[model samples]
Target: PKRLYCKNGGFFLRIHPDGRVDGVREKSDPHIKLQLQAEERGVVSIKGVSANRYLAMKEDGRLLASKSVTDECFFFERLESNNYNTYRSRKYTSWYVALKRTGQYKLGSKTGPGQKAILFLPMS
Candidate 1:
């Protein structure tokens, strides 16, 4: 399990039991643990360790947790120059995983590599 710490919000990505994806400021948060499994070269599926749900992005750029792994769950991992990583949707290359400054999930359509909200530091 790993923690995906959002740089902009100073929070960790969290998946709720009810299939909602959000962020929490506390590193000790139980729902913060995520298992990132590689499905192909440079692509991976992010799953919640506790909730047992896969992180998925819809065509409208909405972020949610899916009960089963699907094409929408695949994200392309990229290492940015700042050492932080960004996860872009494999199905929608222009969409990214992001968190707002208020520790809320940001729509992927509103995110990009240049945005600090899209930068995440993966920790053990």
Candidate 2:
């Protein structure tokens, strides 16, 4: 997906260069832009378009905007039941880039075949 749309609340995942990440309900805002770039070996890095910040995982498993590229930021796709994609951290394979029940971005370890928290729809 080029832009990640939060499945539950219909928000878009927005991030900043200073490690700020949030779900933007107002897609009209310019900050709600994200870019997913493919890397070698089935890995990808998700970055904020305007900020040029990449989505990264903390050792605590929190999501953040990264200043520099790191292995923790790389993700490998996990296909959902309907053939959608769930992103799992390459460094932390057990953790997923997910949205909480309230649509807040978080890393989850309780992933199944199709969990709403990890389900994302591609937006133009």
Candidate 3:
């Protein structure tokens, strides 16, 4: 069982100096920022049937992304739709299943929570 703190219906992150924190944070005593750490990194390969229905191997014949198959990963997709859509991070998120079904996602790279050493380049 995991306990969490919420503010205004959104989860509130409590930063820990050196990656340690007590309970939830109030206004006066804000938690300190710590080093980037997490089990998985975004843009990485994930095993188990991908939400994307596309062929696992890319055009180059590489195996597709799998959370259970490889290490940690997450991804971001650009939406050309006119309406608004939600962003997802974890399996509990409703968007996770939705995007997975697309099957268009290809294995990109590794990612970790709070880590930001990667960047995306748009092509024409």
After superposition, candidate 3 runs with Cα above 4 Å error:
1-5, 8-12, 21-25, 32-87, 90-124
Maximum-lDDT candidate: 1
lDDT, model 2, position 73:
83
Ranked by lDDT, the better of candidates 1 and 3 is: 1
In candidate 2, where is summed lDDT lowest over 10 consecutive residues? 106-115
lDDT of 3 by residue, 1-124 (tens): 1112221122222333332212233423333121122235333222222132111222332223332222222323222233222223332221221211122221222222221111111111
lDDT, candidate 2, 5-120, per-residue tens: 87766777888667888787776766667777889756789888778888888887688888789987899876566556778888878788887656577655555435677777
> CA lDDT of each candidate?
0.92, 0.76, 0.24
TM-score of each: 0.96, 0.86, 0.20
Q: Lowest-lDDT window of 10 residues in candidate 1?
A: 77-86
Best by TM-score: 1
| lDDT tens readout by residue for model 1, 1-124 | 9999999969999999899999998889889999999877898899999999999999887899999988899999989986899999988889999999998899999987789999999999
Q: What lDDT, from 0 to 1, does candidate 1 have?
A: 0.92
